[PDB]
Design a binder for this molecule. Sequence first.
Ligand SMILES: Nc1nc2c(ncn2[C@@H]2O[C@H](COP(=O)(O)OP(=O)(O)O)[C@@H](O)[C@H]2O)c(=O)[nH]1
Ligand code: ALF
Ligand SMILES: [Mg+2]
Length: 317
Amino acid sequence: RELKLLLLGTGESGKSTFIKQMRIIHGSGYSDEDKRGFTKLVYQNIFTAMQAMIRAMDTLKIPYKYEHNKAHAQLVREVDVEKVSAFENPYVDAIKSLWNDPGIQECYDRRREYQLSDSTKYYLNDLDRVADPAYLPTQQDVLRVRVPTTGIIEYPFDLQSVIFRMVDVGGQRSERRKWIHCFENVTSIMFLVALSEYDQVLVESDNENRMEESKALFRTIITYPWFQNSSVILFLNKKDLLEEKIMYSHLVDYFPEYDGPQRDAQAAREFILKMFVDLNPDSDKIIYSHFTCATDTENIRFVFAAVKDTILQLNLK
Ligand SMILES: Nc1nc2c(ncn2[C@@H]2O[C@H](COP(=O)(O)OP(=O)(O)O)[C@@H](O)[C@H]2O)c(=O)[nH]1
Ligand code: ALF
Ligand SMILES: [Mg+2]
């Protein structure tokens, strides 16, 4: 009855964000209790970002500008999110002072040297409103919250006239080996790759570029013999991150083969798309690609409007 889909990609790529977007558009919008729960999630995300960037500053031995905030920094090291609660007054001022500190700002601008959530800037801009006790996060705040998924999570859903069940899976290397069981009757595969992953290395490995791992995984998935009868769609996510990363980072250093002009977001996107589509072994196969940004509802709407039609045309029964 209902067709089975997979959302595949390396960790942090953005699969769960697309699941949230699909639920929001063609499902049930999140309720007040949902946002109340997500407030704590946002709180621990902010705490994790603060701790990670302080640890990065320490490892990189970058001096601080504010001596007083150093005390707060120590307090930051003492905060533990296992026995977590709502944000408290003594922490909001310290976080604001740290974020306003130019030294840690430069450290974050150098974020390529360590792992960090892409939502850090958004929450930092939010500042008091998010940290305000009267926290009423909007759909954007809920979408821009990071919660590492793990294990196979089937998400039943249906279109206006057809039923298409999705499957969200983890992207961490240790977890990918659990996918064996979700390939039983795949009707079409959606693959997510972070356009901005070209600069950051994996989390599980600090020496392998994320883009190389993503390309290897895409090749491995296409090489699967039993997917020959299933369509594949390559969602190029996080274009809004890449349009700034390229402006701030040169794609030549990551992949020198991209000899195109610098600062051209469209050129870099086209180069990445060509590089990924080249990995297919046999040209008779067709690969559909769509630039997108899971954090924007309109882009997901537009992409899905055609993805559903393509899937329906692919499977006539
Ligand atoms: N700015 C931006 N952030 C994104 C986009 N896609 C995903 N993210 C963020 O990336 C973080 C991690 O994505 P995640 O949901 O874990 O994807 P998953 O690893 O495949 O499950 C989330 O907190 C999202 O807010 C995007 O297109 N643009
Ligand atoms: F990297 Al994930 F769920 F965020 F596998
Ligand atoms: Mg996830």
